[PDB]
Amino acid sequence: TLEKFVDALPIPDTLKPVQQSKEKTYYEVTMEECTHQLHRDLPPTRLWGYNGLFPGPTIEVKRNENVYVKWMNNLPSTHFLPIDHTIHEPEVKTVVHLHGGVTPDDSDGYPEAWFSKDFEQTGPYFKREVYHYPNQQRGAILWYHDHAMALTRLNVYAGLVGAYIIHDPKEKRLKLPSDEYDVPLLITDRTINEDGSLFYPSAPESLPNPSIVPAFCGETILVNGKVWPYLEVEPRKYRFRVINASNTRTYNLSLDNGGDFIQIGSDGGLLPRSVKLNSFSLAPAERYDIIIDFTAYEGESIILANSAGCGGDVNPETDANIMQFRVTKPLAQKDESRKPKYLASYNIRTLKLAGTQDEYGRPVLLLNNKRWHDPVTETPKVGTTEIWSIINPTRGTHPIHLHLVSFRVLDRRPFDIARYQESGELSYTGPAVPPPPSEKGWKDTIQAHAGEVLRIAATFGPYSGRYVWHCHILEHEDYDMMRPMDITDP
Ligand SMILES: [Cu+2]
Ligand SMILES: [Cu+2]
Ligand SMILES: [Cu+2]
Ligand SMILES: [Cu+2]
């Protein structure tokens, strides 16, 4: 297996605008096939990257900055990963979703708004080449990634992911670590062949060939596009924007010297109060805004470790490892940053997760026993607030993402699975559990654990129109755990 911690952690450069005035910022981003060495000991890997980079460039904007992005397809006309033609016209379709954006519906990256090379052919919901991001929302870690119908798992695995940070000037007074000491960490698990080519399975364990798989667990962990990298840090406080950009894998992170993280933010921005954590779970598309205080660790080498299984227990030599901090950089200036505790102050619908079998015996995961193409049923009115009760009788956790909105977590409550099977009665096995401090703020991708009812509160606005909601395990999303969500407007 590849030798750990021999490549320095890359820091993606921040995208520079094509045009910027005091009232509008314009960017162009092209998806290109490219080659990058993912590890010292590998030949370069064929990838698809935004602007030919993996991950794509970090996009930085200010709250309320009026942003326009022309996303363009410069990719080949055929895929290099295995395409399953049975889960449903050009083979390569792309569309960019700004994950967490408060975005008008025609710029949200609707899965059927895809386009092929040079916009030659486009999906039924395609309407505009330049997307509009008003950024009228709390400061937060967003990220952007491909979202094309029936291809999202492949296009994201190919490398189509990157970071997008909303800075709110009103948070500067908190004096959290900034500039060189504010570092995105985009975590992606991969399986890589000896010749450096990406491996993605074409079959699970009659079946069509290739065939979609129900889950993908990569053999190797990458951060910002390098296998098991190291980062040299100064003995001081850093801010890290941790993004799970993996297809399926959930991480449970910790530092092997016993140190603690300080969580300051979740998907939807700063928490009300920061929280000291020895470990934390991060499912696909979740984000954790954290501070790590390296002051007392000068000279140490610290491993960011992982304890969560993916199809089995972690391997201490491989996926138990994420990256390595080396506290050996000399202080370049006094640490003037802070870690405050106080940070800020801030209809019902039942939905069922379930899994059926298709004509090949393969599992199909569904929201409310509906298929993507069935007539829309989630149709809240613009400006209204709802409590969604998400029932999970499956054996695993599903990370549920709603577009446009962020929401508060109300509680989780365990129920009797076997009973729910027979009669559909919710026989509760214990009292409701309010969210821990990590979930007392705003979320947009939330872990619905097995055997539990999860309640979230969301206000459906400011915009109206056709969005989606779905599980963010990409293998589930593509077959077929995604539904349209219509926010109706008089
Ligand atoms: Cu997403
Ligand atoms: Cu989204
Ligand atoms: Cu799922
Ligand atoms: Cu989505």
User: Residue 169: is it exposed, middle or buried by C-beta count within 10 angstroms (0-12/13-18/19+)?
Assistant: exposed
Method: X-ray
97 is annotated as contributing to ligand binding: yes
471 in a labelled binding site: yes
Question: Ligand 4 centre and the CA of 2: distance in Å?
Answer: 33
d(CA 291, CA 176): 8
**For residue 476, which ligand has an atom nearest its CA?**
3
Nearest to 457 by CA among 410, 391, 400: 410
The CA 62 to ligand 3 mean position distance, Å, reads: 33
373 annotated ligand-binding residue: no
Gap from CA of 400 to ligand 3 centroid (Å): 8
Indicate the SS3 state at residue 167.
strand
Residue 285 CA, ligand 4 centroid: distance in Å: 10
DSSP state of 13: P
Of the candidates 113, 132, 226, the residue with the CA atom closest to the CA atom of residue 467: 113
Query: Mapped to the 3 state alphabet, what secondary structure does 44-107 carry?
Result: CEEEEEECCECCCCEEEEECCCCEEEEEEECCCCCCCCCCCCCCCCCCCCECEEEECCCCCHHH
Please check whether residue 102 is in contact with residue 137, taking contact to mean a CB–CB distance below 8 angstroms. Answer: yes
User: Beta strands 321-326 and 348-357: pairing type?
Assistant: unpaired
Residue with tokens 């019902």: 348
Ligand in closest contact with the CA of 244? 1
- Asked if residue 449 belongs to a known ligand binding site, the reply is no
Q: Is the dihedral of CA 209, 212, 217, 222 positive or negative?
A: positive
Q: Is 99 annotated as a binding residue?
A: yes
State in Å: Cα 447 to ligand 3 middle: 10
- Host H or E run for residue 254: strand 251-255
In order, the DSSP letters of 305-353 are EE---SSSPPPTTTTTEEEEEE--SPP-S-------SB-----EEEEEE
| Cα separation, 466 vs 125, whole angstroms | 10
Locus of tokens 């080659």? 35
In 290-320, which positions are buried (b, 16+ CB within 10 angstroms) versus exposed (e)? bbbbbeebeebebbbbbebebeeebeeebbb
88 is in an annotated binding site: no
Looking at this protein, which amino acid is placed at residue 172?
Answer: K
183/171 Cα distance (integer angstroms): 17
Token digits of residue 289: 């805004």
Selection from 486, 438, 450, 448 nearest residue 465 by Cα = 486
C-alpha to C-alpha distance for 177 and 121, rounded to whole angstroms: 45
- Residues lying with their CB under 5 A of ligand 2, a single-atom ion: 99, 403
Phi-psi group of 368: left, alpha or beta (phi > 0 → left; psi -120 to 50 → alpha; rest → beta): left
What stretches of 375-465 show up as alpha helix (H) in DSSP? 417-423
Residue 426: exposure state from Cβ atoms within 10 A (0-12, 13-18, ≥19): middle
Separation CA 360–CA 117 (nearest Å): 33
Are 238 and 120 within 8 A, CB to CB?
no
Strand partners, 132: 68
Hey, how many other C-beta atoms are within 10 angstroms of the C-beta on 418? Answer: 8
Backbone angles phi, psi at 390, to 5 degrees: -100, 110
**CB neighbours of residue 129 within 10 Å:** 11
Q: How far is CA 243 from the centre of its chain?
A: 6
Q: Is 132 annotated as a binding residue?
A: no
Domain ranges of the chain: 1-167, 168-344, 345-490
Query: Do residues 471 and 408 lie in contact, with contact meaning Cβ atoms separated by under 8 Å?
Result: no
Cα distance between residue 397 and residue 215, in whole Å: 12
Contact call for residues 71 and 27 (beta carbons, < 8 A): no
Q: Residue 124, exposed/middle/buried by CB under 10 A (0-12, 13-18, 19+)?
A: exposed
47 within 8 A of 156, measured Cβ to Cβ: no
- Cited resolution, angstroms: 2.0
Residue 232 DSSP SS3: strand
Report CA-CA distances (Å) from 196 to 53, 86, 345, 485. Answer: 17, 29, 49, 40
Taking the C-alpha atoms of residue 355 and residue 364, their distance in angstroms, rounded to an integer, is 5
Give dist(CA 292, CA 412) in Å, integer: 29
Q: Is 145 annotated as a binding residue?
A: yes
- Dihedral (Cα; 219, 220, 223, 225), 10-degree rounding: -100
Cβ atoms 129, 119 nearer than 8 A? yes
Distance 55 CA to ligand 1 centre (A): 15
- Token pair recorded at residue 233: 């840090």
Q: What is the DSSP string of 396-407?
A: S-EEEEESS--E
How many CB atoms lie under 10 A from the CB of residue 433?
11
Among candidate residues 339, 327, 316, 240, the one with its CA nearest the CA of residue 282: 240
Q: CA-CA distance, 182 to 139, in Å (whole number)?
A: 14
- From the number of C-beta atoms within 10 Å of its C-beta (0-12, 13-18, 19+), residue 357 rates as exposed
Structure tokens at 366: 């569904």
